Amino acid sequence: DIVMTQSQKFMSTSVGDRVSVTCKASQNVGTNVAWYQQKPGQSPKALIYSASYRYSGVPDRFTGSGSGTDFTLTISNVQSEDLAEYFCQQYNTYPYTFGGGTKLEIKRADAAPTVSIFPPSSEQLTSGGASVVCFLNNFYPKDINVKWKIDGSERQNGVLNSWTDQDSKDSTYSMSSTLTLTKDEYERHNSYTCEATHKTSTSPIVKSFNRN
């Protein structure tokens, strides 16, 4: 089969700049090459066909070039909503084959996390479990740590963390941390705290509640 190679799995740019994603075919595929965009949780969307023609409704900031084996997707005046994975593909010969993808990352200014903590709902407690949730939202850059304390003591087991990709509107990151306890364990303690450490503050950014 024809191998399509994208040798930059990640490329970093800034809003308003120009970025070029490269793609190399192992053998001549003429101009029978397409480009696709894929954002998290979504199907792929075609950008370019015949190596240089834009699909309907695709902004003219997207341009394609190349013939033979070297192909380029160029994005001019990069917008925050261009945050996505980009795939090249040849349909010259069976089987049609895709490049490995290139993820676009957008540089922006530092942003401190907005922290919110939530107690277990009465709905969850009615069946014997108890999750405490902490959202650490809209921060930049991506590096961040979260620490849970129960009545002042650090709690490590029972914590599950999840992170979003960069937001399509403001290019920040967010994170969700969930501390799951039993209802019985939860009701033995009063103070519940989640602490974020991020480069935007030399102290932890903290949120708490008392079960009172």
């Binding site: 792929p44 075609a46 089987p95 895709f98 709902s121 969850q124």
Partner: protein, 216 residues
């Protein structure tokens, strides 16, 4: 405009088979190739093959011969992909897709993707819990979607009319069950005064649940 409707999920046991449907509307079904694509979680794209509904001409990726079978039913404008002898390597999202021409450009359409999970586990619907601030300019609310199987779940707020300021987190698998959460941030003048509701769909269990966030 054109819709390709695929079921959200299929849970099938190892060794069995599955037939994924792609119901098309908005164009002449028998005029266009219908393509099928496989995508494994966090991985790239694989072309399975294509079928032309006129006479069911097919072109297959050789790697899927004996695994995938493409057919069509012109009476219902539906395309099908059958997968035999399922293994965990078959677990993936499967898309159908076509394109037609308008003005001076092609325009593509895709199904939402069918998440096939190959597993002997049972379906388990999620429990949906409201996240309200215990007793500022902006207020953050959320929805905890806990203990479901298999993937996916989709989350909206106010039936989709609340789309700014939402973060919906990837699920995490623990003790054979998935859990995810979604947060939404709104002006403090609009909530509690106006209602905020998370809508949670788990296609594998045919569940759609609404949870109103009411203040504590």
């Amino acid at each position: 405009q054109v819709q390709l409707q695929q079921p959200g999920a299929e849970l099938v046991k190892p060794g069995a088979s599955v037939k994924v449907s792609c119901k098309a509307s908005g164009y002449t079904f028998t005029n266009y190739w219908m393509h099928w694509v496989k995508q494994r979680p966090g991985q790239g794209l694989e072309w399975i093959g294509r079928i032309h509904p006129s006479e069911s001409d097919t072109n297959y990726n050789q790697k899927f011969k004996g695994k995938a079978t493409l057919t069509v039913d012109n009476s219902s404008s539906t395309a099908y992909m059958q997968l035999s002898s399922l293994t965990s390597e078959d677990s993936a999202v499967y898309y159908c897709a076509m394109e037609d021409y308008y003005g001076s450009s092609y325009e593509d359409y895709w199904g939402q993707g069918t998440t096939l999970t190959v597993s002997s586990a049972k379906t388990t619907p999620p429990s949906v819990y409201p996240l309200a601030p215990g007793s500022n300019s902006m207020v953050t609310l959320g929805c905890l979607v806990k203990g479901y199987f298999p993937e996916p779940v989709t989350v909206t707020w106010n039936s989709g009319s609340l789309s700014s300021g939402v973060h919906t987190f990837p699920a995490v698998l623990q003790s054979d069950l998935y859990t995810l959460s979604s947060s939404v941030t709104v002006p403090s003048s609009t909530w509690p005064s106006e209602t905020v509701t998370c809508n949670v769909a788990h296609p594998a269990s045919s569940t759609k649940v609404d949870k109103k966030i009411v203040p504590r």
